Amino acid sequence: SYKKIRSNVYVDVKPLSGYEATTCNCKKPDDDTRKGCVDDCLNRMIFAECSPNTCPCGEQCCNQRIQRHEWVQCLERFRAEEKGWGIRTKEPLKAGQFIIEYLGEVVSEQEFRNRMIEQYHNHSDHYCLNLDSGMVIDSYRMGNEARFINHSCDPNCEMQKWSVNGVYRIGLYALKDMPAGTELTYDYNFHMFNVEKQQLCKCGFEKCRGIIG
Numbered sequence: 209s210y211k212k213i214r215s216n217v218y219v220d221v222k223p224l225s226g227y228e229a230t231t232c233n234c235k236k237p238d239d240d241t242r243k244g245c246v247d248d249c250l251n252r253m254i255f256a257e258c259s260p261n262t263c264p265c266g267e268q269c270c271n272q273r274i275q276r277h278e279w280v281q282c283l284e285r286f287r288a289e290e291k292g293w294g295i296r297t298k299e300p301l302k303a304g305q306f307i308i309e310y311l312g313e314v315v316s317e318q319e320f321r322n323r324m325i326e327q328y329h330n331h332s333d334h335y336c337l338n339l340d341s342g343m344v345i346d347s348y349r350m351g352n353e354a355r356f357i358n359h360s361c362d363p364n365c366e367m368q369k370w371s372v373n374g375v376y377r378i379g380l381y382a383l384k385d386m387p388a389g390t391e392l393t394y395d396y397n398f399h400m401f402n403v404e405k406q407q408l409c410k411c412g413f414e415k416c417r418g419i420i421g
């Protein structure tokens with residue numbers, strides 16, 4: 209239970225990326241149906257999204273996925289085995305594919321530490337990612353479906369920090385091909401803000417670490 213938000217809620221923090229000037233030099237394809245900025249793209253290489261009114265490809269550019277909230281419509285919440293409630297795809301997914309933005313409240317470290325002590329006592333789950341410079345996307349109360357995605361020691365998805373119009377935002381990308389019905393997973397230890405509490409890992413993998421965080 210949470211409020212669904214279409215976009216992040218900025219509380220007491222602004223996660224400015226520091227860089228702004230972005231022009232591709234990767235060129236428009238003549239076909240309307242063929243995508244513009246692919247793996248060559250200068251901006252994509254530094255994990256920055258193109259700006260629509262400056263990009264050499266304009267509307268052909270597929271390096272604006274967060275900006276344009278170009279999420280996938282497969283995602284389905286389901287009764288996960290031992291893990292509670294998880295999320296899978298009804299449709300096959302290819303590697304490198306943008307899946308969903310991770311949404312929530314953007315809060316400072318002290319604001320989150322406050323919320324942890326003041327409000328998130330005797331809580332069995334942990335809904336938040338490190339963003340930047342000790343800023344946190346908290347999704348305990350507000351967020352999207354990306355909050356139901358479980359941990360794996362062997363993940364098929366990955367949280368990527370992007371500069372979008374001067375602002376850092378986190379997007380979920382596939383690491384491998386995934387067929388219909390398969391649950392989405394990522395490695396928490398990377399992104400999850402270090403909390404004193406530890407949890408047994410039920411990801412069910414040969415070389416499972418046995419612990420989360």
Ligand SMILES: C[S@@+](CC[C@H](N)C(=O)[O-])C[C@H]1O[C@@H](n2cnc3c(N)ncnc32)[C@H](O)[C@@H]1O
Nearest residue numbers: 291292293332333334356357358359409410411
């Ligand atoms: C961000 S929530 C994920 C959604 C959660 N499954 C639910 O039902 O709301 C993280 C919590 O899910 C559970 N969880 C996620 N991955 C797990 C795993 N690999 N093994 C056991 N529990 C897991 C843990 O209780 C963890 O605190």
Ligand SMILES: [Zn+2]
Nearest residue numbers: 232234245249
């Ligand atoms: Zn480009």
Ligand SMILES: [Zn+2]
Nearest residue numbers: 245258263269
């Ligand atoms: Zn572009």
Ligand SMILES: [Zn+2]
Nearest residue numbers: 361409411416
């Ligand atoms: Zn594991």
